């Protein structure tokens, strides 16, 4: 009640260490153990909360690994002080994890902080708790109890950060670290719940990663398929391996077509490339109304011709906007090459035939929807206008864009890769990619509950929730439980047993 909690802890440490040698020289061994028992009651006995809540969490936040190990000793010797240690420090885990994801204004940085708290608690176990396992039990319990509460802020932020770690830079060439931080991804986000939204978003992420730019490594994606195969269903990693098999099918079609133009001897500059896919293992894509230069339409018909062979049973529903393409660009003061997107490639295709178009037939002769075309003009316009030049300036954009293509263009590099768009995405794009999972759980829980009542006739709702939580990779809301109860009654697999929702039957 005079010194600080760490000061009193060091005093207790040294004063207990005093009482040994008193016996060692002169006092009695058989009263050494009564002496330490009494003294430890006098110092540490009956003070296992006012030392062990604040002065625990205070010196954990200060993270003095010496005194944390000191109190670990000083409360692993004592009568039961490690129980107070486990409870106070585990509540400390829950709250000091909870100081991340419940913050809706602070979603720009969540994943790195989660990694940080994971790292800190791991280090406090491995030295400050000296690889005891009770602490690990409280850790995992506390983490899962925490993240059952917010499922679909983290898994989406986590998916974006997983994709961010799946980028090809010049800074990283040791994928061993990215293997190790990938191991931390798997282990740490096994605490994070709602993995179906992460799963579908990772379909979106491999789409946005292959379709523009290039991935961090081949073995990185292979290791992720093998790792995410674990901890989820074995029919939950059928689509991803289907992605890479469909990519190999498209490459084999590429080899076949290149061999079939080996005797036609292409020397022309105009290229067509379609990597074709099936809708069972990929993100779904529906064509949107867009306008294509008629030679591209000729290439579409060529694509039909080479499409109709090789496992016929095939019928066109083409996409002609989702790729990125390399293009040479005429300007004054040099001819450099652009790596750009099809939304912008059509823009640049019209800025060959003339300079002087306006947003009316830029809206029309592209055909591009408003949501895509605004963000198309947020790249290389709404700033840095030396290729396209848009009459509204700044973040605010009005419907009056007047364009005259610029002769002037300056940069110090070749292969001018100015392409945010397809390695970016919009808010309602994310929201819609979430709703394609929201009322997609419907058939999942439908199948699960029809199988349950086909297995056990009576099951209260507080047990249906637990069987579903056992079975599924995401947490099911109480609203969705009412939703499936009512729809099962609509399709005659439930009857309310005893005229209340307490129990049910499988009678129609």
């Amino acid at each position: 009640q005079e010194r600080e909690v760490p000061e009193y802890l060091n005093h207790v440490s040294k004063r207990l260490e005093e009482e040994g040698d008193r016996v060692i020289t002169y006092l009695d061994h058989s009263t050494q153990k009564p002496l330490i028992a009494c003294v430890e009651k006098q110092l540490l006995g009956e003070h296992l909360t006012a030392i062990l809540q604040k002065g625990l969490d205070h010196l954990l936040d200060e993270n003095r690994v010496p005194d944390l190990a000191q109190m670990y000793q000083l409360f692993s010797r004592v009568r039961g002080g490690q129980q107070a240690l486990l409870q106070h420090w585990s509540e400390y885990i829950k709250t000091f994890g909870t100081a991340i994801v419940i913050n809706p204004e602070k979603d720009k940085d969540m994943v790195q902080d989660l990694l940080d708290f994971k790292d800190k608690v791991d280090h406090v176990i491995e030295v400050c708790f000296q690889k005891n396992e009770r602490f690990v039990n409280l850790m995992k319990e506390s983490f899962e109890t925490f993240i059952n509460k917010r499922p679909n802020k983290p898994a989406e932020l986590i998916a974006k950060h997983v994709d961010s770690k799946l980028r090809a830079g010049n800074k990283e060439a040791t994928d061993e670290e990215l293997e190790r931080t990938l191991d931390k991804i798997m282990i740490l986000f096994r605490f994070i719940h709602g993995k179906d939204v992460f799963e579908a978003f990772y379909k979106k992420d491999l789409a946005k990663r292959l379709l523009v730019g290039k991935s961090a490594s081949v073995d990185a994606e292979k290791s992720m398929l093998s790792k995410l195969k674990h901890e989820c269903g074995a029919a939950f990693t059928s689509k991803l391996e289907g992605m890479f098999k469909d990519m190999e099918l498209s490459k084999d079609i590429m080899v076949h077509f290149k061999q079939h133009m080996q005797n036609q001897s292409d020397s022309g500059p105009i290229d067509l490339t379609v990597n074709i896919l099936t809708m069972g293992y990929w993100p779904t894509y529906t064509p949107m109304e867009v306008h294509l230069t008629p030679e591209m339409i000729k290439l579409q018909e060529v694509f039909k011709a080479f499409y109709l062979g090789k496992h016929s049973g095939r019928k066109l529903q083409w996409q002609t906007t989702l790729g990125h393409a390399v293009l040479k660009a005429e300007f004054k003061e040099g001819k450099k090459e652009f790596q750009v997107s099809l939304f912008q490639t059509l823009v640049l295709l019209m800025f060959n035939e003339g300079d002087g178009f306006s947003f009316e037939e830029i809206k029309m002769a592209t055909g591009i929807e408003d949501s895509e075309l605004r963000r198309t003009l947020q790249s290389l316009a709404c700033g840095k206008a030396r290729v396209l030049i848009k009459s509204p300036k700044g973040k605010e954009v009005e419907d009056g864009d007047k364009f005259i293509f610029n002769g002037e263009f300056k940069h110090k590099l070749f292969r001018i890769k100015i392409n945010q768009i397809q390695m970016k995405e919009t808010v309602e794009e994310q929201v819609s990619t979430t709703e394609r999972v929201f009322q997609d759980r419907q058939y999942q829980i439908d199948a699960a509950i029809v199988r349950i009542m086909k297995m056990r006739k009576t099951l209260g709702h507080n047990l249906l929730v637990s069987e579903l939580y056992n079975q599924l990779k995401f947490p099911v809301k109480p609203g969705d439980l009412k939703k499936r109860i009512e729809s099962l009654i609509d399709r005659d697999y439930m009857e309310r047993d005893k005229d209340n929702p307490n129990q049910y039957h499988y009678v129609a």
């Binding site: 067509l272 074709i276 896919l277 083409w318 002609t320 990125h324 040479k328 295709l349 060959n352």
Partner: peptide
């Protein structure tokens, strides 16, 4: 020949079903 001379068009797309449900 043009203000962008066409060197590469590349696309990703889906091959679709053709059997009755």
């Amino acid at each position: 020949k043009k203000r962008f001379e066409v060197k590469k068009w590349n696309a990703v797309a889906l091959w679709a079903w053709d059997i009755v449900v």
